[PDB]
């Protein structure tokens, strides 16, 4: 954090015990920060919705069994954390991570075959 408030020197996981330790510390910081993210970015959602949505973004990469893949996925998180905790991301970038503030909404793929057929592939 020498050059910037939430800077972390790029580090390469030594092994799976180390790599899982870092993931849990990353998740902990994010869900800790959710009240602070909800006031600054004036997110019109419960802190619970923010936390459950933060969980989904870690739940996507729960089955990665490559150690070189985890470090890039950790660096992406740390950088996202830094630009959100410093007021660098605009409210527009942050509340665009929630995929229900599209005027089409969360429902943007067709539900099944027939409903996407009657609408021309959605």
């Amino acid at each position: 954090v020498q050059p910037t408030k939430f800077a972390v020197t790029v580090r390469q996981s030594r092994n799976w015990a180390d790599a899982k330790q870092r993931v849990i510390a990353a998740y902990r910081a994010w869900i800790r920060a959710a009240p602070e993210i909800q006031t600054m970015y004036s997110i019109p959602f419960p802190v619970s919705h923010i936390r459950t949505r933060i969980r989904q973004e870690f739940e996507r990469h729960r089955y990665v069994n490559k150690l070189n893949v985890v470090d890039v996925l950790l660096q992406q998180s740390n950088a996202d954390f830094q630009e959100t905790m410093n007021f660098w991301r605009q409210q527009s970038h942050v509340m665009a991570f929630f995929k229900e503030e599209h005027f089409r909404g969360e429902k943007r793929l067709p539900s099944n075959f027939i409903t996407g057929f009657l609408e021309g592939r959605n």
């Binding site: 390469q12 092994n15 799976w16 790599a19 490559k66 150690l67 070189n68």
Partner: peptide, 16 residues
């Protein structure tokens, strides 16, 4: 054998 040898983290890159 990157990226294969990097799957298990058997090698660490020599940092400055």
């Amino acid at each position: 054998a990157e990226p294969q040898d990097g799957f298990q983290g058997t090698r660490l890159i020599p940092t400055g």
